Paper text:
X‐ray crystallography provided two crystal structures of the Gly192Cys variant, revealing perturbation within the ‘breach’ region with Cys192 in two different orientations: in one structure it faces towards the hydrophobic core while in the second it is solvent‐exposed. This orientational heterogeneity was confirmed by PEGylation. Cellular analysis revealed that the novel variant was mostly retained as insoluble polymers within the endoplasmic reticulum. The variant showed a 40% reduction in inhibitory activity and a reduced stability as assessed by thermal unfolding experiments. Polymerisation involves adoption of an aggregation‐prone intermediate and paradoxically the energy barrier for transition to this state was increased by 16% for the Gly192Cys variant with respect to the wild‐type protein. However, with activation to the intermediate state, polymerisation occurred at a 3.8‐fold faster rate overall.
Numbering used by the authors: 24 to 104, 111 to 343, 352 to 393
């Protein structure tokens, strides 16, 4: 797991940017799928264009060799393959493509590349969206809304995750509860609750409750419920070592946990978003994509990421007679999904309003 620290720092730089944009919308994205997509894309780039991408993924190219970077990602794909994800490359049908790139995309990163007639904008937009919808079986519809006029290369990265808890909730105990969108305003949401033994603890550094729940597939969801007026403090203080320390501890205590059902999405323009992380040339006219096509000019004019999450109710636990704490996730909270093997950040998000 040599590239795990870089993924974690890429997750945070990506999160802190989205949280800076707007603080009133739900955030949810996959650092792993985005970084894998652009690490794979780098195989067809050279020189500054190539360096901007790996550096943009938080890889110090003067310290870690690229062989380890791609080896780390491919070793992560072997682990990762209910999680449905896909990355589609759509290239203009008039381009002479380099076989090496198409091999690397299919063999090494297990991704898909298609040739499109970008002369028909509406039909290109349809084939792109039909591909996503077919890969998510209708969960993600009409992803791409528009295409630039000079579009000759589009990238689409989708991921849909349905969480199956190790310790499930009982549907009969789910009912409507207030969700405090702020200190004086509430909104009713469906709220799951269970009295049991949880990996839960209040953290002084983070000023937050920290809940860890395993789900089926050797991965763990970490929820950070900040104290009153501590959301910004929580987001600033999060580090990979703090997260790793929590994964190490397995001690449980009793609590009456209230956790809302979640059906949230995140749709992001990777050209805009990754542009503020330093990845700009691959989207510009001076892009060195000579590993993709050898003679014609090429640039990535479209890159979209959509991530969809479903949290619901989806072994006997002995509960002491002491008064259990009441931990309600009824206000904005931060969360991550961590793969247990590689410790890599599968997903990261913030719920400002489950009903949004």
């Amino acid at each position: 797991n040599k590239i795990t620290p870089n993924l974690a720092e890429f997750a945070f730089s990506l999160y802190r940017q989205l949280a800076h944009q707007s603080n009133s919308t739900n955030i949810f994205f996959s650092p792993v799928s985005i970084a894998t997509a652009f690490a794979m894309l780098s195989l067809g780039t050279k020189a500054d264009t190539h360096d901007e991408i790996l550096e943009g993924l938080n890889f110090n190219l003067t310290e870690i060799p690229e062989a380890q970077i791609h080896e780390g990602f491919q070793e992560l794909l072997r682990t990762l393959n209910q999680l449905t994800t896909g990355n589609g490359l759509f290239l203009s049908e008039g381009l002479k493509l380099v076989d090496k790139f198409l091999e690397d995309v299919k063999k090494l990163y297990h991704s898909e590349a298609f040739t499109v007639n970008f002369g028909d904008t509406e039909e290109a937009k349809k084939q792109i969206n039909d591909y996503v919808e077919k890969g998510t079986q209708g969960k993600i519809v009409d992803l791409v809304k528009e295409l630039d006029r000079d579009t000759v290369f589009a990238l689409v990265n989708y991921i849909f995750f349905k969480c199956k808890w190790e310790r499930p909730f009982e549907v009969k105990d789910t009912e409507e509860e207030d969700f405090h969108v702020d200190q004086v305003t509430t909104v009713k949401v469906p709220m799951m609750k269970r009295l049991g033994m949880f990996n839960i603890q209040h953290c002084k550094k983070l000023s937050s409750w920290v809940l860890l729940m395993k789900y089926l597939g050797n991965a763990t969801a970490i929820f950070f419920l900040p104290d009153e007026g501590k959301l910004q403090h929580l987001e600033n203080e999060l580090t990979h070592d703090i997260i790793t320390k929590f994964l190490e501890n397995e001690d449980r205590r009793s609590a009456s946990l209230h956790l809302p059902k979640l059906s949230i999405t995140g749709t992001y323009d990777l050209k805009s978003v990754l542009g503020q992380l330093g990845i700009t040339k691959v989207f510009s006219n001076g892009a060195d994509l000579s590993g993709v096509t050898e003679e014609a000019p090429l640039k990535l004019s479209k890159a979209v990421h959509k991530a969809v999450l479903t949290i619901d109710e989806k072994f006997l636990e002995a509960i002491p007679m002491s008064i259990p704490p009441e931990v309600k996730f009824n206000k904005p909270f931060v969360f991550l999904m961590i793969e247990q093997n590689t410790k890599s950040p599968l997903f990261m998000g913030k719920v400002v309003n489950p009903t949004q």
